[PDB]
Amino acid sequence: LTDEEMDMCRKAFAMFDKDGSGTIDTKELRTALSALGQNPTEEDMFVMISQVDQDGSRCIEFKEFVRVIQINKQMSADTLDAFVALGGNLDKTGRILVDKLRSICEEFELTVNVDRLVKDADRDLNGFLSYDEFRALL
């Protein structure tokens, strides 16, 4: 759907079908799994390919490659990372504990820090940050 995903898809398809056959055969796939540490049976890999092989080829190709990347990616951009930053640990409640931020500044051992930021990002002027004013912080 995008244009750099085609770039990474071509690079990974190059990585898998490493000999140059133009088709993912089972041996190169097991080579990739064994480089990742896994050595499963020779009957489960058959079922895995048979679900991914649509053409009846017993070998999957670039159209099928991007079909599986498409379904797994877009079925499940900046909402998630800024969201789950701290407020996404609270899940639509708008009240962040100060003790979480004290713990974060505790573990990473930072030399000098004063928490006046949370004092001066206070937009409800209560002592916590809702999510819209949390993005206003970011």
């Binding site: 896994q38 499963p40 489960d44 079922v47 895995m48 048979s50 679900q51």
Partner: protein, 140 residues
């Protein structure tokens, strides 16, 4: 989606909820087996352990039928061996229907659910003919 399978005598409780519905029970366990195989096509240590757990569960459920199969066998062995009223009372027994219920319970479990008592089951079947011969000699 692995957690939806978190599962041994609860099976006996399921049996306490109760003929071919038994076969339906074994087939819904078979359907759990086939969707596990589809997930094998999707996904293995965490998978092989529950695979072996299915190996545990259906074999033990087959054996908790097989024990009742043995009980059916022995209680049938029992009956294998003013008198005219007793002769008529045994002459009324539908008895072949009870032998057939036991035969259907056993052989379906052996074949479609896949001891030396198979020939004993055959001699169960022929037992009624032998008993009729004995009753014929008991006519006088």
């Amino acid at each position: 989606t692995f957690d939806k399978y978190d599962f041994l005598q609860a099976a006996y409780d399921h049996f306490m909820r109760s003929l071919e519905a038994f076969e339906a029970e074994l087939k819904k366990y078979m359907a759990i087996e086939t969707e596990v195989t589809m997930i094998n096509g999707v996904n293995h240590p965490l998978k092989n352990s529950l695979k072996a757990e299915a190996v545990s569960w259906k074999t033990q459920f087959a054996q908790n039928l097989h024990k009742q199969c043995s009980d059916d066998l022995k209680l049938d062995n029992y009956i294998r061996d003013l008198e005219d009223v007793r002769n008529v009372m045994a002459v009324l027994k539908v008895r072949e229907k009870e032998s057939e219920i036991d035969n259907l319970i056993g052989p379906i479990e052996e074949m479609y659910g896949l001891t030396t008592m198979v020939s004993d089951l055959r001699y169960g079947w022929k037992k009624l003919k032998k008993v009729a011969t004995e009753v014929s000699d008991n006519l006088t």
